[PDB]
């Protein structure tokens, strides 16, 4: 019972918001990430890094505000406030996009603090640490998208800017430049997300519709008691319903709930790997056999060749303003267009 | 062809800027989150019925009457991960929330497409921010529009004879 | 030489066979287009 | 179509190798007492 054990006593007190040792990392890093985002979206411009207004103070709404990435000439600079770019000037640091790296780094260490908190509480309450393990998927996504992706690219400029429309641009950029929908790792991510949402909806509806009558109310929530040993719904009835509707059904509740962990976690991990490839421009952009055939046969058309024409439109129309460090002047006659439009 | 449908739909309707698709995204992201959350919390609180050399799933028998996990321990964990009143202690309320969140969101996503069918499109903030002289100050919404224009001018590149794509 | 006592039998039930074969065949259905390119 | 010349064997082994791994493990499970 030295000073360490006395400090360990206080950090793990049963209070309203648990602290723990992880709370030393989680709480300041998460609050600065959140507070940095709310600060930038309320007050900070993107005029010098992107040529964009991006705060409420400039006139943007909630959908259009962002803490935008630094200028492409920053490279992968950490953009520390005391670093050689800002040199301690907070105002210049904000104008250089120093808030973006502030949010991304405090957010990264905050996420590390959150998984440590999951591990710490699970160890203290005596449960298995599967919630910490499932949280590795959001960590893999944040690390691949906001860190590994721009680190493979020219600068932090091409990471997502922390904002709603800014994120939508990032989606459209990945379509037009990376053809990211064609990527099988993204497709595995889509199956994990939509499968997990299916599993969320299907499991919740099945439980709620195979409930045992454990009370007289027509509003059935009161008939559950948190200390009951018994199942509140009929696994046998649920199993027979789905076996006859759909052909298969869960018969093991433990496997069912593991599969609910597995599906969206595996999906997000799969999507992270595809983005790691896109950090190097290792895209699933084309199918070579279709390109050889289309180049020699001008009647050969698929939805895939149609999507590449859309991709070429996206690149030529968006690049001069989306990449204003390149100083793209595309004269109007060079622009790919269809007839009339 | 699905991806072609999506890209053209964004070009013509700005679906990303429609709140019903955004509610739809919150449905499926939330559904996937809550799937992983409910799966992990139940798996984390499974009652020890097996040894180390066997799968834990054999600890559950089909049709047994006792519950196979400790919901009080799971609530005790999750109520300390966030705070106590953010965590469900009612499994019926929990499972209704698991049904209700993705379903309502996907309902809204369906009404997104179905009302963009009648050309009530997502939010248009093109040239919304203007300086003191009148210069357009671009936002991220104007960058979205530049991508939308490139999809618009290239889609069905032989099909349009007149300057507006009206349907 | 006496047997090794650390040995354990291995199992894979039928549902795990069906799940794995579903996973392998769907992954092959997904990736085969990219393997052919 | 001018497809990858190794794509057929890459697909055939991608199926057959883990499929037979599961078949081996399943059948030896059923033959246990």
């Amino acid at each position: 019972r030295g000073w360490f054990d006395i400090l360990d006593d206080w950090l793990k007190r049963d209070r309203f918001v648990f602290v723990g040792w992880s709370g030393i990392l989680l709480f300041p890093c998460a609050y600065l990430a959140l507070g940095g985002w709310l600060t930038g979206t309320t007050f900070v411009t993107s005029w010098y890094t992107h040529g964009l207004a991006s705060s409420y103070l400039e006139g943007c709404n909630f959908l259009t505000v962002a803490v935008s990435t630094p200028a492409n000439s920053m490279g992968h600079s950490l953009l520390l406030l005391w670093g050689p770019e800002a040199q301690g000037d907070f105002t210049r640091w904000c104008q250089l996009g120093g808030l973006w790296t502030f949010i991304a780094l405090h957010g990264a260490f905050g996420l590390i603090g959150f998984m440590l908190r999951q591990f710490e509480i699970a160890r203290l309450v005596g449960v298995r640490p599967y919630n910490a393990i499932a949280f590795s998927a959001p960590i893999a996504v944040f690390v691949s998208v906001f860190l590994i992706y721009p680190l493979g690219q020219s600068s932090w400029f091409f990471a997502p800017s922390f904002g709603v429309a800014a994120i939508f641009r990032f989606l459209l950029f990945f379509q037009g430049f990376h053809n990211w929908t064609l990527n099988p790792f993204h497709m595995m991510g889509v199956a994990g997300v939509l499968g997990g949402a299916l599993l969320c909806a299907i499991h919740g509806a099945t439980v709620e519709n195979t409930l045992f009558q454990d009370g007289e109310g027509a509003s059935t929530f009161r008939a559950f008691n948190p200390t009951q040993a018994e199942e509140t719904y009929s696994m046998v009835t649920a199993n027979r319903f789905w076996s006859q509707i759909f052909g298969i059904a869960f018969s093991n509740k433990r496997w069912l709930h593991f599969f609910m962990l597995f599906v969206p976690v595996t999906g997000l991990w799969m999507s992270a790997i595809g983005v790691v490839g896109l950090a190097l421009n290792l895209r699933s952009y084309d199918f070579i056999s279709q390109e050889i055939r289309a180049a020699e046969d001008p009647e050969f058309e698929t939805f895939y060749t149609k999507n590449l024409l859309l991709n070429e439109g996206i690149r030529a129309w968006m690049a001069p303003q989306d990449q204003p460090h390149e100083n793209f002047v595309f004269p109007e006659e060079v622009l790919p267009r269809g007839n009339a439009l | 062809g699905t991806f072609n449908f999506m890209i053209v739909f964004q070009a013509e309707h700005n679906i990303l800027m429609h709140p019903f698709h955004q509610l739809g995204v919150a449905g499926v992201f939330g559904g996937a989150l809550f799937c992983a959350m409910h799966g992990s919390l139940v798996t984390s609180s499974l009652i020890r019925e097996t040894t180390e050399t066997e799968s834990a799933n054999y600890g559950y028998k089909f049709g047994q009457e006792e519950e196979t996990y400790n919901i009080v321990a799971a609530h005790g964990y999750f109520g300390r991960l966030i705070f106590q009143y953010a965590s469900f202690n009612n499994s019926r309320s929990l499972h209704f929330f698991l049904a209700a969140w993705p379903v309502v969101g996907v309902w809204f996503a369906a009404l997104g497409i179905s009302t963009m069918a009648f050309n009530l499109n997502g939010f248009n903030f093109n040239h919304s921010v203007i300086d003191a002289k009148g210069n357009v100050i671009n936002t991220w919404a104007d960058i979205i529009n530049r991508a939308n224009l490139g999809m618009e001018v290239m889609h069905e590149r032989n099909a349009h004879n007149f300057p507006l794509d009206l349907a | 030489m006496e047997p090794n006592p650390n040995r354990q039998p291995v199992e894979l039930n039928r549902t795990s066979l069906y799940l794995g074969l579903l996973l392998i065949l769907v992954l092959a259905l997904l990736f085969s287009s990219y393997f052919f390119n | 179509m001018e497809v990858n010349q190794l794509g057929l064997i890459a697909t055939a082994l991608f199926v057959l190798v883990p499929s037979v791994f599961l078949i081996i493990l399943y059948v030896q499970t059923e033959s246990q007492q």
Partner: peptide, 30 residues
């Protein structure tokens, strides 16, 4: 060979559906 491959895998999946539904390990109440 490509078309054969894709149809083959598809047919194996559909066969797997048949065995997974009609020759499943029967869920037993115990």
């Amino acid at each position: 060979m490509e078309t054969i491959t894709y149809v083959f895998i598809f047919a194996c999946i559909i066969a797997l559906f048949f065995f997974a539904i009609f020759f499943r390990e029967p869920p037993r109440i115990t």
